[PDB]
Assembly symmetry: C2
Homo-oligomer: 313 residues x 2
């Protein structure tokens, strides 16, 4: 039993994507005992205020500004950087996804070239499909294919190229962590709660025509604990790691568990295109972080208790 | 036209950039950076007045850049590790880092030209004319690590162009052909015809490309440098004509009397036609018609097979 603020102390941390599902808990945890700055647009009313109240310095910063003006007034003595902000490309503009994310990586790394470690969050969506249940490793083939969000993996391959190159040119120790499905009791709860909201609405949930999709769910409390360890593993050349939990979780199994807990019935629709998650081989991540602690059934149950308690018996 | 410049070329032993380097050497100081593993190729370049500098993208660190001048005015980055061995991380790392180190070293240049590929476009219909805004998926079953490495390298190039304020053009090249080297895809098909090998073609229709003759390719390079900008200028770099692959092979047979052994197949190598609108705005029209170009290339490489 140890407070999560004790994972790291006395540092000066820059976080992008600090309003988001992944990096907000990291920024909040690290703000207790470190100086934490969150850079973003803060378009959601009240979020900047909550971050400020929770001890975080906020700085307006928009990746869509192509010039360098976005960095005026930003300190250059951060020790640690988490770059989690993303333009996924839902609008289908693949050139914009490539340009905006890649240039932001280069400008941010250059600004923070004196830092001890830079952590870039990426995705497993860029893996080439083998089978739906395969445990993807860091060396498995890559393609730019995600039918559910086509521009997203392409933008991430481009950004990873920029990150690798700047890590070497600047001699800035870096980790590229290809993240799996994050979930937890903050925000909107992650993909598991997106599917629960579809269940409540009677909206169809696309599933594969053969088999089910698989993932390596990663709970917030484990994700937060891993960040200091991922910084410690940063290197030149950049360290690459598939970042997921320790349990293989079937997506349809997760939906069935939501049904069991709540009594709400799901509508599964076999489809050519699904939200195509993958599970990861946890070998390399475990080498860096040690084992995860939160079992997924316990974690999902408590996420429901936090965000949808009225639907639990 | 270009004179009095100082030009850094990578990939100067290759099919694309060697004619460019040789043509620029007449009125400019040209340096070719590479490994020169082919016996005799380094001296062939030196005999044109090209300065050669041993430079290996596989080398870790910045040691490969020791002693390299930093006052180049123009850069053509054509060298590539395509990833034939399947090691996708090595291909992504080597190419991306080389782009970053080269651009940073040459951050004072007037313009940087990066050669990319059309293979990264998401496949549409056989005769689709791909534009610069068409979707991308990095799929190439024939060389999986290659388009992925080009997407990664393009991301590095775009980022360094902005960070360094280095005007850049990214030119996604089509199929190049001409009398040098082994002649390009048209001559590879002719070699198969000479060997009596089967030529796979689609069961319906044909594959389409935008062949670019190397005389036109050479002429375009100064214009591509002139179009360089921040953010990087993106252009699909092909010829002005949609060329059917089956039509090309049939024309080879028509010229030579060597029979082409076409075999309809569900699996054939994919080729891409480019919309030439943006390239033409930058370079003007091409000058080599494809039938003349293919015939002249045959005359250069296989003269005994023309009547
Ligand atoms: N399960 C998941 O959630 C997974 C996420 N990832 C990766 O994790 C990282 C975070 O994802 P997640 O937390 O889900 O993101 P969210 O979708 O929850 O939020 C997006 C984040 O990006 C920031 N952002 C978007 N556009 C801009 C911009 N133009 N300028 C500045 N900031 C911007 C937003 O900041 P603001 O609100 O201030 O605009 C917000 O913090 C991303 O790199 C993503 O690819 C990978 C795999 C799974
Ligand atoms: N039709 C075509 O030929 C097309 C080509 N392209 C692009 O055009 C560019 C040139 O292609 P092409 O001329 O066909 O290439 P080639 O296959 O003819 O030659 C490859 C070139 O890469 C250089 N190279 C490879 N590995 C290294 C290394 N480790 N260190 C230094 N140099 C290296 C070689 O130099 P050395 O001999 O000194 O080792 C050689 O000059 C590439 O970027 C390619 O992606 C795109 C579309 C079509
Ligand atoms: O649902 C996913 C997702 O499925 C993946 C992913 C796919 C395969 C392998 C690993 C991760 C993402 O990378 C991801 O960012 C999301 C996501 C997108 C928008 C909003 C919330 C989450
Ligand atoms: O044959 C090709 C090729 O066909 C393409 C290409 C594909 C689709 C669209 C545009 C170009 C390449 O980009 C290319 O570099 C080669 C090549 C591979 C190995 C050695 C020499 C050349």
């Amino acid at each position: 039993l140890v407070p999560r603020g004790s994972h790291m102390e006395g540092k000066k941390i820059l976080v992008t994507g600090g309003t988001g599902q992944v990096a907000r808990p990291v920024a909040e945890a690290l703000a207790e005992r470190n100086e934490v700055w969150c850079l973003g647009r803060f378009g959601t009313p009240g979020v900047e205020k909550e971050l400020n109240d929770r001890g975080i310095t906020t700085f307006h910063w928009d990746m869509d500004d192509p010039g360098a003006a976005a960095y005026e007034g930003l300190p250059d003595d951060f020790t640690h950087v988490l770059h989690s902000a993303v333009r996924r490309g839902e609008d289908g503009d693949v050139n914009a996804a490539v340009e905006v994310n890649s240039v932001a990586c280069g400008r941010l790394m250059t600004h923070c070239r004196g830092a001890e470690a830079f952590l870039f969050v990426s995705t497993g969506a860029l893996y080439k499909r083998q089978t739906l249940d395969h445990a993807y490793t860091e060396d498995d083939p890559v393609d730019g294919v995600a039918d559910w969000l086509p521009a997203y993996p392409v933008g991430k391959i481009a950004a990873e190229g920029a990150v690798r190159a700047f890590a070497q040119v600047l001699n800035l120790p870096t980790t590229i962590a290809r993240l799996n499905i994050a979930y937890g009791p903050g925000g909107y709860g992650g993909v598991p709660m997106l599917y629960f909201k579809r269940m409540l609405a009677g909206e169809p949930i696309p599933v594969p025509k053969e088999g089910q999709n698989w993932c390596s769910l990663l709970h917030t409390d484990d994700l937060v604990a891993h960040v200091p360890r991922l910084w410690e593993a940063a290197a030149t050349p950049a360290t690459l790691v598939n970042w997921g939990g320790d349990e293989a979780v079937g997506i349809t199994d997760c939906v069935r568990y939501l049904e069991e807990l709540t009594g709400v019935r799901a509508r599964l629709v076999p489809s050519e295109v699904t939200r195509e998650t993958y599970r990861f081989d946890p070998t390399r991540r475990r080498e860096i972080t040690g084992p995860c602690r939160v079992p997924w059934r316990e974690g999902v149950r408590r996420t429901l208790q936090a965000l949808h308690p009225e639907h639990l018996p």
